[model samples]
Target chain A: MLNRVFLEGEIESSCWSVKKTGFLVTIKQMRFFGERLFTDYYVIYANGQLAYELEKHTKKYKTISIEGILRTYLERKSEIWKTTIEIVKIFNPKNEIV
Target chain B: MLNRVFLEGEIESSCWSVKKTGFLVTIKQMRFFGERLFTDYYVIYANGQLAYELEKHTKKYKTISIEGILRTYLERKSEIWKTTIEIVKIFNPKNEIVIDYKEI
Candidate 1:
């Protein structure tokens, strides 16, 4: 079972994976606009694939918070993996859904 | 006349719509990487909403190939919609873009 994570917001142009504590974590910067809008995201990956994407977007201005969403994705890592696999199967059969 | 389709590569962020067998069929799930990367996609939409998103991406690895590059999308979906409405008023007033036009 692999764990994956995803996130998006304003100003994001791409996605990248970082290895932390021997774990591959993924981050996607979003493209945002306006003064009172903000967003932060975190996702976990398993078996070198995307598992889940947790999002936090603010309609009002404030400090960006990522810890809670990260923790949530981390905690439900396995379940997230399962769901991702199902979705991947629906879209890509012969291709590795990971 | 709302039939939209667009595509993107590298790592797709978000988009989704499902209706089993109705008219609105939206599916976006991409974040491809490396080799022989072939992709599959289609486009169609209606109402004051997104109508389609087609995609095509690839390298020598070659697994990315969304049909017709999912028809170039505007900076934002809304922009596409704005243009689409104009296109709709110009091209397909209320039916399929192809249903109403035939070129020999």
Candidate 2:
């Protein structure tokens, strides 16, 4: 009954944005397969407290590491299933663990 | 970049089926969150040779471990993205590597 994912990647365009309950961030991991390279993006939600800390210390376009729980939800209209990461821990490229 | 996942879960019903290029298997990972329990399923593709060994030895409802690279593809019509695991290794609950063969 374990659901977890460790993602290390670069931050998307803007560092993040404030949401009702927390902050939302995007991290992209580069995928290597066949002869070409592709990238997978992870939308991570950081809770109020953690998100606050992340916002204060992180920068855009920087590489970071994240530890989080995997959460899946559905798009009501299309019934398409989507997954998101709920941040458990985060670390900046400078070794700052948030 | 590192795109890998280590999943430990139970095999879905019917075990597996042969695909044109290999074998298709589903593993369900149970999630514990909020007030209710949820399950996430991983569609794994084992190449012909490796899959042949998997189909020959594995069974349904059994727990197993998998190590694989993550692959994502788009559902052309809906434009929805889906992910799959291209298995690099597999193992049975009993410590059988399945590096070669193991039922279900």
Candidate 3:
């Protein structure tokens, strides 16, 4: 059950919504599949300090740093994703790689 | 850069569609989120000898052992999944992990 993911990309919608404890941020990237271009998406589940780091920097252009466990499952018979970078260790990025 | 996943579950739809180089297999598992049950789905991309193993021994009731790199991306503007047991080192189940009534 070792599902881990590291993604570096531009912040999407350029806003982080604060929840009771954490915030949700979505990032976008472009991936090529031989002949097609797909919009790659990643969600950042920032909690505690990580949540604050994301909030402090409010821009969509800067490359955001994300590192966390990837969670994939189903929802209403559809392939829903909880694929957020719930950063456990590194929240602030000097220079991050996706 | 590094994406990986490990899952043990029952195969769904119970059929293998052969491709030019490999095949696609789907598995289902139930996961609980608070009070609701979600049908966890996974695809198996078995190629080379692993493709042969899946093709030879497949059943709706049998448990599958899957190990692969997890690929998650967006389709057009939506996020789809290529989350299969691809690029694996070990596959197939034995004994209690997977029971074959045909064998019995």
Residue lDDT tens for model 3, B12-104: 753446454776677766666799877566666667787667765563236666556545444545534233346474454653332111111
lDDT of each: 0.23, 0.64, 0.54
Pairs in steric clash, model 3: A7-A98, A8-A98
Across residues B4-90, which tens digit of lDDT does each residue of candidate 2 receive? 456677777424453457777777778755888887777777886778666654544376677676556667878655766777777
How far residue A38's Cα lies from its native spot in candidate 1, in Å, is 1.3
Best by lDDT: 2
TM-score of chain B, candidates 1 onward in order: 0.19, 0.75, 0.65
TM of each candidate vs. truth: 0.20, 0.70, 0.55
What are the per-residue Cα lDDT tens digits for candidate 1 across B37-87? Answer: 343222323323322321111112222112110112233532211111011
Predicted model with the maximum TM-score: 2
Give the number of the best model, judged by DockQ.
2
True lDDT of residue A35, candidate 3: 94
List the candidate 2 regions with Cα displacement exceeding 4 Å: A13-19, A54-61, A94-98, B13-19, B95-104
Residue-level error in angstroms, candidate 3, position B42: 1.9
TM-score ranking, high to low: 2, 3, 1
Ranking by lDDT: 2, 3, 1
Residue lDDT tens for model 3, A1-80: 23344456676644544344876666666667679876555566666776666665544236565556444533445555
| Span of 10 residues, lowest total lDDT, candidate 2 chain A | A13-22
True contacts kept of each: 0.00, 0.14, 0.16
